[PDB]
Design a protein around this ligand. Structure first.
Ligand code: GDP
Length: 169
């Protein structure tokens, strides 16, 4: 009920939201927790791998980064960029790092707030939130409002606190 009330309230206005990460990060699982007892509409786009998910006033644009996406490079009007990171995939974490900086470099995202969800934190020996932040060098980003939040999309633990950081903006 507490995550709900803040969501319902967060949606007093329409928000444009990007949610990115590597395949299997937990992006879809997260938009599902967001979708409980809500009205959902999903739609592919033209000329891109982007899926548009509308959950009651919030327009999420989502896609995977990495692979053939790396070999490509909208942002405009997006209030929030959500990067979902799989806390256990140390191997490909650097791929997310390179993409994250290529996005923030575009002037269209000048005003977008940055939310990192360190997901799959229920898994043992996963990377800490402190290691994710310093690996992604989040303190070096001075032209953007940012927050990192540990979460577990399966149960939705942490997702209300990332939403509070967003609503607070
Ligand atoms: N153990 C664990 N698994 C998760 C978590 N979030 C998502 N998953 C699982 O990881 C898989 C991929 O997640 P998915 O949301 O499909 O990723 P997507 O490709 O980024 O949209 C799914 O099988 C989920 O069941 C989490 O916090 N912990």
């Amino acid at each position: 009920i507490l995550f709900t009330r803040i969501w319902r309230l967060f949606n007093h206005q329409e928000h444009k939201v990007i949610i990115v990460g590597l395949d299997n990060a937990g992006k879809t699982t997260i938009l599902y927790q967001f979708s409980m007892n809500e009205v959902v509409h999903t739609s592919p786009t033209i000329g891109s791998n982007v899926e548009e998910i509308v959950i009651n006033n919030t327009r999420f644009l989502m896609w995977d980064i990495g692979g053939q996406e790396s070999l490509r490079s909208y942002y405009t009007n997006t209030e929030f960029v959500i990067v979902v990171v799989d806390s256990t995939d140390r191997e490909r974490i650097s791929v997310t790092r390179e993409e994250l900086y290529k996005m923030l470099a575009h002037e269209d995202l000048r005003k977008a707030g940055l939310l990192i969800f360190a997901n799959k934190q229920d898994v043992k020996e996963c990377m800490t939130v402190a290691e994710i932040s310093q690996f992604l060098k989040l303190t070096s980003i001075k032209d953007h409002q940012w927050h990192i939040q540990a979460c577990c999309a399966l149960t939705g633990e942490g997702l209300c606190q990332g939403l509070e950081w967003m609503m607070s903006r």
